[PDB]
Amino acid sequence: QTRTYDGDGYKKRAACLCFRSESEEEVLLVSSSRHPDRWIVPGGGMEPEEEPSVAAVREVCEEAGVKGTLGRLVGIFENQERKHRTYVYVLIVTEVLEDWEDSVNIGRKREWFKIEDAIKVLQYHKPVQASYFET
Numbered sequence: 321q322t323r324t325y326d327g328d329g330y331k332k333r334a335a336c337l338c339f340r341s342e343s344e345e346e347v348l349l350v351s352s353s354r355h356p357d358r359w360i361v362p363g364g365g366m367e368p369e370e371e372p373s374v375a376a377v378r379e380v381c382e383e384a385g386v387k388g389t390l391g392r393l394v395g396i397f398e399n400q401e402r403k404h405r406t407y408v409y410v411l412i413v414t415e416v417l418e419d420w421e422d423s424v425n426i427g428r429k430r431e432w433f434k435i436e437d438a439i440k441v442l443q444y445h446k447p448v449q450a451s452y453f454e455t
């Protein structure tokens with residue numbers, strides 16, 4: 321995996337808000353790779369020349385083991401402290417795979433959260449990810 325960057329040196333990333341249905345009431349979070357007791361929004365680095373929507377879908381397959389119907393771009397979110405900029409899309413989950421790349425390789429977990437609970441668990445370590453749900 322080759323990391324890529326915007327012209328200002330921020331790492332380029334993409335992520336999806338993986339909703340259980342079109343109602344957008346429950347979202348799938350995954351565990352942090354290094355701190356299994358924490359939750360994050362699945363996402364990761366864009367590859368060279370990779371469209372952000374393609375990266376987002378690829379990352380959620382790898383990290384969360386789901387596929388679905390890609391929806392709208394929510395926004396582009398900067399983490400000033402960590403110097404990265406993430407394109408965040410809606411994805412409506414239609415397939416949940418039982419063994420997926422990060423489960424097998426690093427024991428990553430996934431869990432469904434009501435939106436307000438997702439915001440709560442993201443706030444302390446991932447306040448920018450909590451802000452994905454603001455609108």
Ligand SMILES: O=P(O)(O)O[C@H]1[C@@H](OP(=O)(O)O)[C@H](OP(=O)(O)O)[C@@H](OP(=O)(O)OP(=O)(O)O)[C@H](OP(=O)(O)O)[C@H]1OP(=O)(O)O
Nearest residue numbers: 321323331333351352353354355360363364365379402404
């Ligand atoms: O603190 P760290 O070393 O453990 O890793 C951070 C983050 O580092 P940063 O804050 O310095 O940017 C990594 O980005 P990098 O800057 O190293 O490229 C990031 O990878 P990412 O962008 O998602 O990249 P992909 O591998 O998904 O493509 C990783 O997410 P995980 O995928 O879940 O491991 C994060 O862990 P956490 O959020 O706790 O799970």
Ligand SMILES: [Cl-]
Nearest residue numbers: 341344345346
């Ligand atoms: Cl839902």
Ligand SMILES: [Cl-]
Nearest residue numbers: 399446448449
């Ligand atoms: Cl973040």
Ligand SMILES: [Mg+2]
Nearest residue numbers: 363364379383
């Ligand atoms: Mg990843």
Ligand SMILES: [Mg+2]
Nearest residue numbers: 321364365379
């Ligand atoms: Mg990646």
Ligand SMILES: [Mg+2]
Nearest residue numbers: 363364365383
């Ligand atoms: Mg990642």
